[PDB]
Amino acid sequence: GSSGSSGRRAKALLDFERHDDDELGFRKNDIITIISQKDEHCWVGELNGLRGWFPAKFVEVLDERSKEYSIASGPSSG
């Protein structure tokens, strides 16, 4: 249906209870949309209508491709 800007999403490997309001917590096996990756160590995603930093190591990156149309293969070795 609708369409717009698409970002990234990291899957939580374990439960992380944010200590500071700035820290973004999450439950084990939780999906969080990455908004601004402060750095290769500290990332900022979105969850429960919240936005805070968190250790990427605690979570895992996800690069999937759905509803793929614009891109496709055709003339392959013939």
Side-chain angles (χ1 to χ4, degrees), residues 7 20 59:
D20 205 38
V59 312

Side-chain angles (χ1 to χ4, degrees), residues 18-72:
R18 84 207 160 77
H19 181 119
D20 205 38
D21 74 297
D22 298 290
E23 279 195 58
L24 185 71
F26 38 79
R27 276 42 160 184
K28 183 178 285 183
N29 318 315
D30 284 51
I31 304 296
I32 314 152
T33 298
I34 303 183
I35 307 287
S36 207
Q37 284 175 322
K38 206 74 174 277
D39 297 294
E40 205 192 303
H41 278 231
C42 34
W43 286 350
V44 183
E46 200 285 323
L47 172 79
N48 274 218
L50 319 168
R51 270 198 298 160
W53 88 279
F54 68 72
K57 64 170 162 274
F58 270 72
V59 312
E60 202 56 46
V61 187
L62 330 153
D63 206 306
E64 60 63 65
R65 291 168 286 166
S66 206
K67 62 150 280 166
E68 33 156 286
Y69 293 88
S70 272
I71 57 173

